[PDB]
Paper text:
To understand this intriguing mechanism of cognate substrate rejection in NTD, we have solved high-resolution crystal structures of ApNTD, as well as NTD from Methanococcus jannaschii (MjNTD) in complex with non-cognate and cognate substrate analogues L-seryl-3′-aminoadenosine (L-[name]) and L-threonyl-3′-aminoadenosine (L-Thr3AA), respectively. In the case of MjNTD, L-[name] and L-Thr3AA complex were crystallized in C2 and P21 space groups with six and four monomers, respectively, in the asymmetric unit corresponding to three and two dimers. However, a clear and complete ligand density was observed in only chain A in the case of MjNTD co-crystals and therefore only this monomer was used for analysis. The possible reason for this could be the remarkably low binding affinity for the ligand in MjNTD, as revealed by binding studies later in this section. L-[name] tightly binds in the active-site pocket in such a way that a conserved hydrogen bond with the main-chain N atom of Lys121 (residue number corresponding to PabNTD) fixes the β-OH group of the substrate in all three NTDs. The carbonyl oxygen of the substrate has a water-mediated interaction with His83 in PabNTD, while the same atom interacts directly with the corresponding His77 in ApNTD and His84 in MjNTD. However, in ApNTD, it has only a water-mediated interaction with the corresponding Glu129, whereas in the case of MjNTD, this group is directly recognized by both Glu135 and His84. Moreover, the catalytic sites in PabNTD and MjNTD accommodate a single water molecule, which is the putative catalytic water Wat1. We also performed biochemical studies with MjNTD against L-Ser-(Ec)tRNAThr and L-(Ec)Thr-tRNAThr to ensure that this enzyme is efficient in non-cognate/cognate discrimination.
Numbering used by the authors:
A (entry chain A): 5 to 142
B (entry chain D): 5 to 143
Write the structure that this text describes.
């Protein structure tokens, strides 16, 4: 799994174009202020252990989110972070689990929909811990 | 080299804090509209051929910019795209070369400062060619 975590003034997105793997969700458009935007590519190795991957990913997000005193999290599928992707069924499973576990831990989570081409706007705060890269190996 | 190309309504940045490897510059704030924002990690393999790498990079930028009818290009140093980075000296050499080559080919380029912490803002247009990853192996 590869993740880029961006401490943002806001993240706004709008689903524009369907792909063959687009999921119809209740958040085709969405916005979250004062948030950690987590851009996530689910990778082929993740298929070995989808559940452990989600757990590892949540541990890293919470480390960052707690250091920054941030409760708003956007889980944003971002397949461009890796050229070794998992299958779509595994990827959906892992993204929804990261969301589900974060909500159980009291975070305010907005999941952007899987399998769409989307427009987005972001403003990255630019302090020393505002942009962080994490590689998760379960 | 790893590149992530994003077709944007705009890209803005402001340098905030100097890292220990910051490039000396006066270009500390900048904005470019209707651009292809090119986030670039220069990798250690690029050390064997910095010239071919910049040429390889520009070739890929050109193919996208021509498809999308874009003339405005941001060259934005982005180490997080790769876990196997080049030296900072090689990275700047390559990024500068990318800019100068694009400039010779008629593109307008904004180059974001290397080794500074920057605030930034981007609006990605959201279509199938609006975000592209490219791996450049130099010829
Ligand atoms: N292994 C994977 N990890 C994360 N995301 C994945 C994926 N496989 C497919 N996707 C999703 O399908 C859209 C098209 O590839 C991807 N779309 C995107 O990454 C958008 N940023 C484009 O605007 C994403 O929703
Ligand atoms: N091989 C390389 N390729 C591209 N950029 C590189 C580099 N080595 C160092 N940098 C730059 O130094 C900052 C601190 O690592 C890097 N900073 C950044 O990538 C910010 N966007 C996130 O901190 C970047 O400016
Ligand atoms: Cl979804
Ligand atoms: Mg738009």
């Amino acid at each position: 799994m590869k993740m880029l975590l961006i401490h943002s003034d806001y993240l706004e997105f709008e689903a524009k174009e369907k792909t063959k793997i687009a999921e119809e969700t209740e958040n085709l458009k969405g916005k979250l202020d004062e948030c950690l935007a987590c851009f996530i590519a689910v990778e082929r190795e993740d298929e070995n252990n989808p559940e452990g991957t989600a757990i590892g990913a949540v541990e890293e997000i919470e480390k960052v989110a707690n250091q920054l005193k941030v409760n708003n999290i956007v889980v944003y599928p971002y397949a461009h972070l890796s050229s070794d992707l998992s299958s779509p069924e595994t990827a959906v499973k892992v993204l929804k689990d990261i969301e589900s576990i974060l909500k159980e831990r009291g975070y305010n989570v907005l999941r952007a929909p899987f399998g769409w081409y989307k427009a987005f706007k972001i403003s990255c705060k630019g302090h020393p811990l505002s942009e962080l890269s994490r590689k998760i190996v379960a």
